[PDB]
Design a protein around this ligand. Sequence first.
Ligand SMILES: Cc1ncc(COP(=O)(O)O)c(/C=N/[C@@H]2[C@@H](O)[C@@H](OP(=O)(O)OP(=O)(O)OC[C@H]3O[C@@H](n4cc(C)c(=O)[nH]c4=O)C[C@@H]3O)O[C@H](C)[C@H]2O)c1O
Ligand SMILES: Cc1ncc(COP(=O)(O)O)c(/C=N/[C@@H]2[C@@H](O)[C@@H](OP(=O)(O)OP(=O)(O)OC[C@H]3O[C@@H](n4cc(C)c(=O)[nH]c4=O)C[C@@H]3O)O[C@H](C)[C@H]2O)c1O
Ligand SMILES: [Cl-]
Ligand SMILES: [Cl-]
Ligand SMILES: [Mg+2]
Lengths: 362, 362
Amino acid sequence: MIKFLDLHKINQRFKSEIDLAIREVLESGWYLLGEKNKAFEENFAKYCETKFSVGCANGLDALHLAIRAYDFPKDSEIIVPANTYIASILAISNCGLKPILVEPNLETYNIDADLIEAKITEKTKAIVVVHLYGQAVEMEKIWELAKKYNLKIIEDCAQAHGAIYQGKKVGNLGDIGCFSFYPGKNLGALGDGGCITTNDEEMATKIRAIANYGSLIKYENIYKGLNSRLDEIQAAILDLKLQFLDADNQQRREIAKIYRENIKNEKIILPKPYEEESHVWHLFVIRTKDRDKLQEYLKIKGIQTLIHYPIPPHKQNAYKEWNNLSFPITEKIHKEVLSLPISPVMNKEEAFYIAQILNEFL
Amino acid sequence: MIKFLDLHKINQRFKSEIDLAIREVLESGWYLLGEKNKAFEENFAKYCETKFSVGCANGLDALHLAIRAYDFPKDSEIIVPANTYIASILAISNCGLKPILVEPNLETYNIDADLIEAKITEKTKAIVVVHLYGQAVEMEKIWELAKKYNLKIIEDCAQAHGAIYQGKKVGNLGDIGCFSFYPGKNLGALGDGGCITTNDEEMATKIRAIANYGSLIKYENIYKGLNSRLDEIQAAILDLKLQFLDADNQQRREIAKIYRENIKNEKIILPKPYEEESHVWHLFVIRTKDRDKLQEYLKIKGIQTLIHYPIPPHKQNAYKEWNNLSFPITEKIHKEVLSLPISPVMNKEEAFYIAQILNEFL
Ligand SMILES: Cc1ncc(COP(=O)(O)O)c(/C=N/[C@@H]2[C@@H](O)[C@@H](OP(=O)(O)OP(=O)(O)OC[C@H]3O[C@@H](n4cc(C)c(=O)[nH]c4=O)C[C@@H]3O)O[C@H](C)[C@H]2O)c1O
Ligand SMILES: Cc1ncc(COP(=O)(O)O)c(/C=N/[C@@H]2[C@@H](O)[C@@H](OP(=O)(O)OP(=O)(O)OC[C@H]3O[C@@H](n4cc(C)c(=O)[nH]c4=O)C[C@@H]3O)O[C@H](C)[C@H]2O)c1O
Ligand SMILES: [Cl-]
Ligand SMILES: [Cl-]
Ligand SMILES: [Mg+2]
């Protein structure tokens, strides 16, 4: 069976270094809010070329912190892509604000910036751009509209660690970037973890306070806070893995290159980034009309696949109130997408096998 | 320097077992939602004598999950002790509900059940009882009022793992129990972690869903959820430490016994539990009129102390709107309390040293 994502094999490359990093935390007797978090924040900010980074508990919490720290009026709207993973939208709902869905461009699977303005109202306060599947959103028209309406740009970078647009890294393309370090991400922990990136020192400080019960000074609570911290053990593992992130992303890109050049099936639509540095290939997403039949065929041929995603947020029981809204581009994507195996440790001869098996489906 | 709480020394007792447990998780390649969480939940439910336990990210999240899962009307009130750690109150605020503060009994530092009814309204939906410092709340009058008004009882058990009232463990004294496993707690992880305990299978299932983005079935979201999980590494460490929790609590109780029998200073008020099994001695809290002078004297004598707590929630900037409300019993406690060193690994001869140093303060 070709595995979709072999996390044991990804992390086995660092077995001795992970052991030493965990043992350093255990021997420090400091498990939270410590030197490994400080070093990881400094190094991840440097990687994104932001002045600041603040660790937190997971990627949804990163988004919740970014929105909550703005303290927008309770009737505020936040624009968000209709086809993202449900967590990008949950963050807005969980802050008590109104998500306003905008279709992706079918060509990019990312928010269509030329559809946003039609949904801006006097209540709009922010845009959550999602760099979906590893592709950076083309930001030029988002920058224009954000400034025209004095909106904040909140990047959901959970799937796109290291992606580039106009020479800037995701996490440095708006007011604040929000990251997941869930174990399956392009930079994965061995547990839940997240961070924000920003150049705004006052927002970095406010988020660091809110994520620690609202406290920067022992015994004192400035804000009504949350509890959203990155464990020292996980910061230590992330800091050692960060050194290899560009190389891992390049390894992914070489699998994507095999698929993009060797799949020749007119009934399968391949991902096509606008620039190679814009895509770090968290997910390699194809579209086909017979998606469930293709997944079963591939399974019979020894190839594990997952769907990102089969049910869009507005069709979930969670968003029952939206189930009769029409987002036909999003609906089509969710009926047609399948994710092919891709990772930094995947053998290239498996990608050639998969490409020819896909060509035999036609 | 006698340390307040030596976590390295607490965890050093389990050095080889923690190494083996972490390595089992790493070699499984399953870091979340796995066998260590299943085993820990089963064993912690058995320990509390509840049918169910659901792991989550931390103790505040445990409380947030318990309240959120009830889906109370948005104008609802929740009764909570005025003198608890601020997180018990943050959980209510963060769910968009109205905290209604009730004074503790000065004799117990726990909610005065004979002051609750005066603050019940038609909007009251629950009581958050807090087993503060390790002492179980006397529940008989809380049970009576909860049933009279059809209120839910949500136990904040963060400080009281293993405490007993009327032969039942904290976490089995209401509708749902909420636990912290923050590293300093009587059962501590090596990172953030938490759980709920309950006999209600439908609430356990709903909380497990909400804590995993609202999803029990892959690709499907029943509820608008959060991301609040217990890492497999932390569940593994908690499960091995749970075997020693009663023995660690008894070791704490023996330090408390030294303080309670050997401090003879009429200007210092000692903690006095109603039954020995009701107190697991997370914190050993004294009161004195010259609290800041006593803390500095003890520091000069080589004894580290902390304050639980010096600023009550209603006086915090976080709750600025409450800063002119009067809770004189809570205010007095916060001006007078100091916590003496106590832990399962503290040397008993240090407790005798501390007791005689306190007697020399008079
Ligand atoms: C745009 C966007 N925004 C915010 C978020 C929220 O970030 P978070 O709060 O940090 O999760 C996400 C998360 N997004 C991801 C989402 O895309 C989805 O990802 P998925 O690929 O379907 O997830 P997975 O199935 O758990 O992992 C994939 C492979 O990995 C293997 N695996 C996994 C684990 C955990 C393991 O322990 N061992 C394994 O071997 C099993 C699978 O084959 O579901 C996850 C729970 C979310 O974190 C997002 O995409
Ligand atoms: C009633 C109630 N409800 C809900 C909650 C919320 O639970 P949570 O969300 O899980 O935190 C609490 C938490 N309550 C505690 C609260 O009592 C307070 O506890 P504290 O004793 O003042 O905390 P501490 O100073 O961090 O730890 C004490 C000693 O431990 C040493 N230490 C600590 C750490 C973390 C370390 O890594 N290494 C060390 O050596 C240093 C100190 O000397 O602050 C904590 C952050 C909360 O988690 C509560 O009391
Ligand atoms: Cl649209
Ligand atoms: Cl009162
Ligand atoms: Mg965590």
